[PDB]
């Protein structure tokens, strides 16, 4: 009766009260429990007919099942998607999340678990204020709901409600004695979540609740969280709380002013100067208690200016937008210690805007600082390397000379990031293996683009030596793409992806210079992927010989002169002559095929299955394995 259960599940989800009654008519007690209580799969969700009835808001279906069939309100199933694989939720949790007040009242009156706990300790009240309906929140609390019950990350019903713009439920929960000093998994309180959400009404009620402002697990006040969020309204309400003393309130005014200088959606020069000048005015007005800032030494990435201590300095650079952004960045990292989540990202936006108007030199050094800090923070920078290579490609297409030591240090960052991805996929389990491999492939492709643009730049002897040394280090690290392609295979392939930006103007594959550089750094010229294709097999299959015969001839002769065994066979026993699909590449390989007795002897050894284990040189066992 599996098909009947699917029909019952379909009827409840579709709200067909007539069809559901006909399907459930003349059914025994065992049949009713089998039909109402079975978990059905549809669209990636494993939900029961009663569970799916609450999500869709079919009150008539819910009332019909609960009143007559007295189905128990303890069914478990996988509900929702998009980062929500929460299991064990009852029908009450689904209705609360979907914002259906009538279903919740019907379920609770029939015996729903008000304090039900899912796998991640989720209360129906947690999902009730998630949607934003005050009646559902009021009904559950009146039905003996424990607000203090949170998840494993310690996010109570007030914290989950403060994420969204539901002012009615957070104020109501404060009336029911919601704890304002609770600490989340990263030491976070409800004030931290409300500050970043840009809700002055929610934040101002917490300070009326004596929120007891305290830093999070990382060590930043919720005032600083709203300061970096470029929310001046949220920041300019804590001064009346009379608990920020003087250092905390003046560092937030600087942080708020600094944040306006670097934002994609909250950038404005006039407001940035107004708050920064006001922060400077309050520091230098009392005189006896004058506030002085411990300015870090001038970082070469941060221009050449060591902030503006004198009052005349800040007024003088008001008209200069570049210095206005630069002064905000220095105090942005100074407050946070330059090791926070959102320190480098505003710098990335500053450089990208700076690169949109034919200005390059100061754009580069900003991203080096962004690349430097994220490496210390164990942060993957595949997107940063990708955009950096894109900007170099745009410079080269504009026949602009790209500075080479920047390429050297970026290549060092690239090999470090690739090693970080290597030991990450060594330690990361199957939970995020797909994302880890995607970042791995992106890192390898960005490194190849960087090698290509290095070969497209006329550099010095020592700079080229350093670049080749770094490539040698990465080659000895021996990366492997998910297809088994080594660094050499991707440099000779035509299917190697290139991003849609200006990299197509410069970077292209196969590229003769990149393959020559890889072979110069001692790459594995006979590397065999999972399928069996060698480094030679990938370019003898190249489908556009005549158009770029130079870059096929160069790579073929470079591979052959580097020791690529031209008679090597894949797992299907196909020599690169067989896997040619082209007369030009086949004959151009044949001109490089120095026939040797060693190859014929190895082929005759392996053809008739002669036991060559430990009876031949160790350098010949792999040679026989080539055939």
């Amino acid at each position: 009766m599996e098909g009947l259960a699917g029909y019952v599940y379909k009827a409840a989800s579709e709200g067909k009260v007539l069809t559901l009654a006909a399907l459930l008519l003349n059914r025994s007690e065992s049949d009713i429990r089998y039909l109402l209580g079975y978990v059905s799969q549809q669209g990636g969700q494993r939900s029961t007919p009663l569970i799916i009835a609450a999500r869709n808001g079919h009150a008539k279906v819910v009332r019909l099942l609960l009143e007559h069939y007295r189905v128990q309100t303890q069914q478990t199933g996988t509900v929702r998607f998009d980062g929500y694989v929460i299991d064990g939720a009852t029908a009450l949790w689904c209705a609360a999340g979907a914002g259906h007040f009538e279903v919740v009242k019907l379920l609770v009156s029939h015996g729903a678990n008000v304090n039900h706990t899912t796998v991640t300790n989720s209360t129906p009240l947690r999902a009730a204020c998630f949607d934003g309906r005050l009646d559902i929140v009021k009904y559950l609390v009146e039905n003996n709901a424990n607000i203090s019950i949170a998840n494993k990350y310690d996010n109570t019903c007030l914290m989950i409600a403060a994420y969204k713009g539901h002012t009615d439920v957070v104020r109501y929960l404060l009336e029911q004695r919601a704890d304002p000093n609770a600490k989340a998994h990263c030491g976070a309180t409800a004030l931290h979540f409300a500050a970043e959400a840009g809700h002055i009404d929610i934040v101002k009620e917490l300070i009326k609740w004596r929120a007891a402002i305290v830093v999070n697990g990382h060590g930043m006040t919720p005032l600083k969280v709203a300061a970096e969020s470029c929310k001046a309204d949220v920041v300019e309400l804590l001064l009346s709380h009379a608990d920020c003393d003087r250092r905390s309130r003046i560092e937030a005014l600087e942080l708020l002013g600094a944040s306006f200088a670097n934002d994609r959606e909250n950038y404005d020069i006039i407001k940035t100067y107004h708050y920064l000048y006001l922060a400077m005015l309050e520091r230098f007005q009392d005189g006896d208690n004058i506030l002085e800032k411990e300015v870090l030494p001038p970082i070469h990435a941060y221009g050449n200016r060591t902030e503006c201590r004198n009052p005349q300095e800040l007024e003088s650079i008001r008209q200069d937008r570049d210095a206005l952004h630069m002064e905000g960045l220095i105090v942005r990292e100074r407050i946070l210690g330059a090791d926070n989540i959102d320190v480098s990202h505003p710098i990335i936006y500053r450089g990208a805007v700076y690169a949109d108007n034919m200005e390059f030199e100061q754009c580069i050094k900003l991203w080096l600082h962004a690349l430097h800090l994220r490496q210390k923070g164990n942060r993957n920078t595949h997107k940063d390397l990708l955009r950096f290579a894109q900007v170099f490609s745009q410079m080269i297409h504009l026949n602009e000379t790209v500075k080479a030591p920047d390429i050297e240090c970026v290549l060092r960052c690239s090999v470090l990031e690739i090693e970080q991805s290597m030991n990450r996929v060594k330690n990361i389990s199957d939970a995020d293996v797909h994302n880890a491999m995607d970042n791995y492939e992106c890192n390898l492709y960005t490194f190849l683009y960087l090698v290509c643009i290095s070969t497209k730049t006329q550099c010095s002897e020592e700079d080229q030596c350093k670049i080749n040394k770094q490539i040698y280090n990465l080659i000895h690290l021996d990366p492997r793409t998910r297809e088994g392609f080594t660094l050499l295979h991707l440099a000779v392939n035509s299917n190697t992806p290139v991003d849609d930006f200006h990299t197509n103007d410069v970077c292209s594959f196969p590229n003769a210079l990149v393959t020559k550089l890889l072979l110069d750094c001692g790459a594995e010229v006979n590397a065999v992927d999972n399928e069996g294709n060698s480094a030679l097999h990938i370019i003898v299959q190249y489908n556009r010989p005549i158009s770029d015969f130079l870059t096929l001839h160069s790579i073929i002769i470079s591979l052959v002169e580097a020791g690529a065994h031209t008679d090597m066979t894949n797992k299907q026993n196909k020599t690169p002559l067989d896997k040619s699909t082209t007369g030009v590449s086949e004959i151009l390989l044949k001109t490089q095929m120095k026939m040797s007795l060693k190859c014929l002897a190895a082929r005759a050894v392996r053809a008739n299955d002669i036991n060559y284990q430990d009876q031949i040189p160790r350098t010949l066992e792999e040679f026989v394995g080539f055939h």
């Binding site: 994609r264 990208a352 949109d356 955009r387 894109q390």
Partner: peptide, 8 residues
């Protein structure tokens, strides 16, 4: 382009 689409 840059910050137009690469920012995200």
């Amino acid at each position: 382009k840059h910050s137009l689409d690469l920012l995200s």
